[PDB]
A paper describes a structure:
An important bacterial virulence factor is the secreted serine protease HtrA (HtrACj), which targets tight and adherens junctional proteins in the gut epithelium. A characteristic feature of the HtrA family of proteins is the presence of a chymotrypsin-type protease domain as well as one or two C-terminal PDZ domains (Postsynaptic density protein 95, Drosophila disc large tumor suppressor and Zonula occludens-1 protein domain). We have demonstrated that C. jejuni HtrA is a periplasmic protein, but it can also be secreted into the extracellular environment. Extracellular HtrACj is involved in virulence as it cleaves the adherens junction protein E-cadherin, an important factor required for maintaining an intact epithelial barrier.
Since the proteolytically active HtrACj wild-type revealed a high tendency to auto-proteolysis, we expressed a proteolytically inactive recombinant S197A substitution mutant of HtrACj in E. coli, and after purification of the protein, the structure was investigated by Cryo-EM. Data analysis produced a 3D map at 5.8 Å resolution. HtrACj monomers have an elongated, bent shape with three well-separated structural domains (I–III): a central core domain that is responsible for the chymotrypsin-like protease (N-terminus up to residue 273) and two joining PDZ domains, PDZ1 (residues 275–362) and PDZ2 (residues 376–471). The basic unit of the structural organization of HtrACj is the trimer, with three monomers arranged around a three-fold axis. The three monomers interact via their proteolytic domains, whilst the two PDZ domains radiate outwards. In the higher-order assembly, four trimers of HtrACj arrange into a dodecamer, characterized by a tetrahedral symmetry, consisting of 4 threefold rotation axes, running from each vertex of the tetrahedron to the center of an opposite face, and 3 twofold axes, running from the middle of each edge to the middle of an opposite edge. The contacts between trimers in the dodecamer are quite loose, as the trimers are only held together by interactions between three PDZ2 domains of one trimer and the three PDZ1 domains of the other three trimers. Within each trimer, there is a small gap that may be permeable only to solvent molecules, whilst the gap on the opposite side of the dodecameric assembly is quite large, being a triangular aperture of about 36 Å from a vertex to an edge. Six large rectangular openings of about 32 Å x 24 Å are also present in correspondence of the 3 twofold axes. The buried surface area following the formation of the dodecamer in HtrACj is significantly smaller, leading to a significantly less stable and more flexible assembly.
Residue numbers in the entry:
A (entry chain B), B (entry chain A), C (entry chain C): 38 to 471
The structure:
Amino acid sequence: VLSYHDSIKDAKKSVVNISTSKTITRANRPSPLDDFFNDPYFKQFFDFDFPQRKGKNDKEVVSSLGSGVIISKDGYIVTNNHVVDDADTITVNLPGSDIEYKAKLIGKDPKTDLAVIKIEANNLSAITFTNSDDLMEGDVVFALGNPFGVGFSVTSGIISALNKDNIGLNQYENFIQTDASINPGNSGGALVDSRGYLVGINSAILSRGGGNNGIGFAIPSNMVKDIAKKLIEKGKIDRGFLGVTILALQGDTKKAYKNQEGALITDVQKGSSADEAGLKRGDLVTKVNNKVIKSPIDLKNYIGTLEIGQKISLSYERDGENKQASFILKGEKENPKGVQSDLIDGLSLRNLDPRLKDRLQIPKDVNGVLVDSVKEKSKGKNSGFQEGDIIIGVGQSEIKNLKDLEQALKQVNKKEFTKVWVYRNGFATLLVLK
Amino acid sequence: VLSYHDSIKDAKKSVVNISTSKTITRANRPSPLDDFFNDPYFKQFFDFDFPQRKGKNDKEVVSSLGSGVIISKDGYIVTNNHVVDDADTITVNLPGSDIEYKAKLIGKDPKTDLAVIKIEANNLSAITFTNSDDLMEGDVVFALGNPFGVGFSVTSGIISALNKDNIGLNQYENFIQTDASINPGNSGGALVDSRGYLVGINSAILSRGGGNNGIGFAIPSNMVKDIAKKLIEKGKIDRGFLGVTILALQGDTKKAYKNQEGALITDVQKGSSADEAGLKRGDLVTKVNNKVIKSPIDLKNYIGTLEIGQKISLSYERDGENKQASFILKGEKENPKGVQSDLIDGLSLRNLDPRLKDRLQIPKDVNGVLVDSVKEKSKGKNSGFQEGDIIIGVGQSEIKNLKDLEQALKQVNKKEFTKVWVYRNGFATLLVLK
Amino acid sequence: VLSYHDSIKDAKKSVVNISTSKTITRANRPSPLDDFFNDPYFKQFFDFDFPQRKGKNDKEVVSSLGSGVIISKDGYIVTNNHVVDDADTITVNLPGSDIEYKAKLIGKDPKTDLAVIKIEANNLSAITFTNSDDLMEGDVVFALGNPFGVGFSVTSGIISALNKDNIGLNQYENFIQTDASINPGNSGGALVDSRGYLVGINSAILSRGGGNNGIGFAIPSNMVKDIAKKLIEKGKIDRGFLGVTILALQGDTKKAYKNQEGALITDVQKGSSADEAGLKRGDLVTKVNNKVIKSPIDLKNYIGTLEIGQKISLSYERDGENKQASFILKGEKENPKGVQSDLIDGLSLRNLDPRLKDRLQIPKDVNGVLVDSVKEKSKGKNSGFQEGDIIIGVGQSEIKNLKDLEQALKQVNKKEFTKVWVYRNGFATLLVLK
């Protein structure tokens, strides 16, 4: 007979079930979903009244169930922090040895949502940690933990997606997808490859009944490697940022922003390291000295893997022109004021109640800002806006003064183009600014 | 590592994702269901507030999200018709080249629910369009497209049921069925064999919330291959009929109707191409010039795949002889009228309120139709019916006259046997009319 | 092509579909859930309005729908009891033969919820009954029958859990699990190995949507093998017991109760075949002559595969010493009463309201039981309990007299340690009795 138990024999020696007595399970508390209340038996079941009364799965209310992986022979375990929030007596149960000591939280971060914990025994297994990004889609894998109280279990699968954020279960995310039947209680148990080496970790699943419908998510194993090291070596993680807001370059933005390529600065968050290194609006982020940028979630989760105060000679372009300049890693809590202008670009413009005829007898249609002149480079002249125009609406939405221009012009480096409405000598026309 | 990415590889460049901008998304409007309503975040998620705001999945109410297949190098895409119903500005994402043109809707048919659509670029992919019906159950397949908007993501699995109607997603059906995980947004997307060739087109799934639960359905490629052609040729498909209600031959119906075999005409829609070809009731449809019949979904779907005014020399049998005249392909809209028979054949029956003693003083029990003669070949004569009985009942249901008699004696060829109740020279028997 | 249709050929030849017609479907009536209602179509769909009307799958209100297996060439089929509860006119549709007879129920046992039924024809197949316990996690299998009324469909998978109770669908349980997708109506249908031999029988599935979401459940084929012989033999099965209460030995029980290894008797159910074989409380059950015990679910389900009145020369131990004596298979309804001592072991206690100064005026903290002596072996003197104490409560719970004392000192053999509350000359201590 062919079986792939052969992974399953050793994989349990690393992948723990977790017993988790906590006086406060208030982070891993269910939200007001209309679930199997009114006849709640053993947790995460569905069946009717059956003879085995309470005791088997109950403690999840003033304790928690979960899974973890012992990363090193030092007996340091990893699991998801929602599983280990309020870490009093985080008892474990290792399938393949049945041992039941308290574990000692060494350190956590709720942003990456991850923890490292010393279990107090010796001759504890490590895990062959390998790289989550040698993967292709279609690669075979085994995903592991204790699903919904059955005991320790493993489901055979393939990858069906790579390196996915837009998920934000907490704050920093790069998930990889398998089709494998996995549940909560596999919360912190592993995803290994077909050779039984560590490639990601389970936490959560897109599905309708909490148990799998095709769409299991693992964290990267490379992510947890450096995350665990930072949670060991100071007992937490400490990020800054480049003090920024960011998007990806979109296809129509690209030609409109003169066919440079990288992540779109939306707004540089003033006087942070971005600004001081001379990054601006209409610029694009291209590369960290270790890591390549195209998207907003690239810088976010790369900085979810960098620490305080080190300088970074980051590469960036504007228009057609690259610089590499020197930026301190400066967070949201780290920013001291700065400049940007790129559809207010030599716009000499000012407030009105103008001194000419004739339109009508209401300020509604004539407060805004009047154009003194328009720089040749400004996307306005690309697009047919001229000196002696009057701006009344900016992205269809209307304005009364310079403040409410400069507020909508601070949202333009978030628009491929702008639907301005510009009154002239007599009529208001519609333009398409890029 | 063994990975069947190799299919995945070229199937993205044929199996499209759809930026289906249309202003009336109201033919695929969500049914009034208790889903994740009042607080739905991104469409087709389950989740509580995560850091990423709106801007990734929301457009599906003034657009749609889907998948399709470029069949020939013309760039003739096919997808579901319901994805493109009201087809205004249907623009594309071709996974792996990102080409955001609109496509011309060349034509759509809402009975099969499929449409042919020219994408206005070049070097656009064929697909290797093999037979769905050379498939057996257990054969290995991949399942393709974009599930719930996660982007282009594939699965692989096996066939667990074949060549099926009784699903009624539209008006013409013959789906084949896999375990592999597929959701909404794979709507119109491919099912390819282990070798990478098109054996079917995914349109729906038997699940409990739209994430796959082992039961996904793809239209056979061989039906889409003649659908797409009739829609390339004139922008629509025109289907006929034989003018004939139809069923499968049930098991006692074989032995009652003397051991013929074929699809059971339940009642002829009168004087049609069936009737003028000799097809009556008590008759069984066996074969179209090209296609073999035992059930009514055979004749239905074979007519689905044929167009008007041609003469089909179809074969049928009655009692114990098989005949071969010729039928026009004549619609429900097309049918002159007709002759019927069965359990009234050469019977002589007329109305009553009788002139003999005795019974009772209420008409409920004695109105009906009386029996002058019963033909010897007739089913009544198989089954305990006599001359000088009075029919009161025609299958546990009662009659006041010839009309409600001859109406149930139209429904007797929807029966294996009939429970007539028949008042005799003094008492009401009950009988078994094979 | 590689496909495992090879087993799917001869499996259908024994794995029946059933059209279980009876007037009383009132055991397999739906329970009040928010499953689909007010809008039903065909049973176990989810789908909106389809052009295939009532007639396909209504009947399971006034019939059952299920699966089974023809065991032997004698025509003897095996299925759930709940499928044939009130076996009126149990009609069959064996796939690939269609022989629409009634079957004759030979016998049933609701306890295992298993049947044996004769189908009344000739040349009927068998099934290759192999061992369910030469088995392992991860071996390849197939799961079979009628998944929601479709015909004969088969899925394929790997074993994900072994020999289990705590599922409780009836009264006796030793199920095995695989991921492979099975629905009610596979009720009574099979699980066969990768060579086509019978290893398991699916009854139900711990799903979220009633169709399989990952967690099917097969009673072992070596359990239904002898069950079937006891059902052929006489139409029913006869279960005794050994007239007892049992649990598995907990780890700190192990160490307190002197490091013996078996199933923990919790309370001997008094003058059974246990007590009159010398078996006591705090004695561990090690081996039945044919079946080795470590848990209660052992002895339960071994009784679940054993008949009346035979004498069973069973192994038990006390503290460090093994005995083997003989035990009749005596029911819950078969036991003359009784011998009982454990943390009352030499405890010479009596009722009080006691004649010394001073404490308080309310009886609430001084009614209880006074301790005249404590024998040296008592887990009391292992743990701090002395003579002249006063027991006021036994594991937090307060006692008023000898009767309430002894109710709780009967349940201590359901504990590893007890937190007795014992008043002394002036104060009350809490203790930890092992």
